[PDB]
């Protein structure tokens with residue numbers, strides 16, 4: 296029974312290193328729909344926010360349909376992966392729960408739409424090719440603004456408004472939080488985001504029970520920004536067999552961008568030249584300069600709830616280094 | 620001939636208080652085209668940037684077409700007025716030889732497109748009514764992002780690329796400057812923009828020729844941002860018979876938005892209720908809390924160049940107050 300094996304894999308929905316590619320395979324290329332549906336049922340969110348299950352499934356299906364099947368990395372599997380990853384980091388003891396049912400709905404919904412309709416090329420490529428997207432969004436977080444616009448737009452399709460029974464004030468607060476979160480997935484925001492995460496760790500305050508003490512929205516949205524950002528950058532922290540599949544996919548997507556750049560005689564973007572790549576050195580550099588500094592700071596913030604995640608990252612870094 | 624009178628009126632293009640409304644009538648409702656053309660000729664700009672005169676006229680007419688002839692204030696007359704005001708502010712003695720031809724071109728071009736395709740309603744209205752515009756731009760500088768997208772997009776129409784002979788670095792630099800400037804016209808940026816301008820005035824450096832010293836992009840763009848912002852908020856600084864017609868038009872536009880709001884059961888925005896608005900009191904508050912703090916700070920930046928403009932503003936403030 297297909298549906299039995301799928302049901303069994305989804306029993307790991309609360310675990311880092313959730314088996315996501317087989318869930319993709321077993322669900323008929325519907326990992327975003329089935330993982331979101333599971334997390335919503337797991338979190339009682341359909342009953343809390345009076346979401347008709349058919350409206351939930353209708354939207355998730357349409358949303359998943361607007362992820363490109365022919366994009367190697369930024370597709371529905373990556374969205375499902377970021378959703379489930381955010382789902383875990385929300386339930387860390389040092390934060391669980393400290394985010395209301397609305398900001399939890401925000402981080403999850405934002406994770407689900409955060410790359411929707413991704414064309415498989417970078418903001419810089421879109422800027423350099425005088426794309427309609429870069430023309431629309433004035434070269435600023437072009438992809439991320441588009442992801443938001445599509446993710447919200449699809450709510451207006453027939454029987455897709457999963458927020459229909461939220462109050463108008465809940466809809467507004469949720470909308471702002473989702474926008475704030477998704478716009479923060481733009482990698483050009485990473486350094487300022489991490490600096491602000493570091494500042495917060497230095498002035499950190501917690502319960503004796505352990506729960507982190509955040510008072511104002513400015514700090515709570517910033518933890519949710521860095522959380523989804525961490526989930527977006529969580530591939531090198533997953534078990535190696537998952538990590539290596541993500542590396543294959545992102546390198547395939549980079550390489551095809553470099554193919555489009557070479558056809559047009561454009562400068563080939565970093566890591567995008569399949570005739571001049573070092574996949575392994577790139578992963579080590581990626582970990583050393585982006586992923587580990589971010590996850591070391593996040594681990595401090597939720598100390599010690601992220602130790603196993605951080606441990607896996609450092610094991611994977613050591614392994615990739617050893618392939619050089 | 621009607622063109623003899625138009626040409627005579629266009630001899631005032633370097634003067635504060637040019638009668639832009641007469642020029643609007645005398646030009647067959649083409650104040651933006653004729654004023655931009657006059658200014659480009661006055662500043663040597665078609666020669667400096669190899670702009671074909673037919674390309675300039677064609678783009679200007681297409682750009683002017685995309686201002687709404689049905690909107691009382693945010694129409695082509697306002698665009699021409701802001702162009703011409705920015706043109707005058709660029710020529711202030713404290714700024715001679717400061718800005719490059721490309722920066723001057725960026726500021727004037729930004730002024731020309733800065734409100735194109737304005738629907739006559741506020742950002743908050745577009746947000747609150749779930750407009751397609753607010754959906755596209757995620758509730759952030761909705762109008763101002765749209766003005767930019769339309770203004771740049773129209774350069775791609777037939778024989779409309781007035782920048783066709785700029786170098787690649789010139790267009791890239793101009794595009795970024797235009798974006799930075801138009802985004803700064805969003806009133807939600809005003810307080811931070813003004814706070815930055817205050818700081819610049821307090822720490823101001825001049826050259827040995829008494830001219831403002833602008834060391835870097837951040838300071839140069841911020842002066843151009845506030846300059847165009849001042850031109851955008853320059854109505855109360857104009858001779859009273861010009862100011863008063865601007866007040867008639869903005870109140871008309873506000874009231875027509877308030878009608879749309881009062882229909883939908885929405886809370887009518889401040890100053891949009893024709894059955895409960897004080898035109899005179901709103902002008903005094905507008906000057907006291909927005910326009911005068913801005914123009915007094917701009918006057919300090921270029922002191923004493925702008926004393927007559929500041930004097931007129933204070934006289935007009937006096938006059939509106941006297942009618943209460």
Ligand SMILES: CCOc1cc(/C=C2/C(=O)Oc3cc(O)ccc32)ccc1OC
Pocket residue numbers: 482530531538541542545566577578581585
């Ligand atoms: C070596 C890169 O590896 C990955 C990058 C990414 C993503 C990136 C992206 O979208 O934009 C970047 C810009 C950068 O400077 C660095 C990384 C990224 C994901 C998985 C990877 O490996 C599994």
Ligand SMILES: CCOc1cc(/C=C2\C(=O)Oc3cc(O)ccc32)ccc1OC
Pocket residue numbers: 804805806807851854855862865866869890901902905
């Ligand atoms: C009492 C207000 O009077 C005026 C306002 C305005 C302008 C603006 C306004 O009310 O909101 C804005 C938001 C923006 O982003 C840019 C400009 C404006 C112009 C003339 C007036 O009177 C002659």
Ligand SMILES: [Mg+2]
Pocket residue numbers: 409410438480481
């Ligand atoms: Mg993304």
Ligand SMILES: [Mg+2]
Pocket residue numbers: 733734762804805
């Ligand atoms: Mg405007």
Ligand SMILES: [Zn+2]
Pocket residue numbers: 373377409410480527
């Ligand atoms: Zn992503």
Ligand SMILES: [Zn+2]
Pocket residue numbers: 697701733734804851
């Ligand atoms: Zn304006």
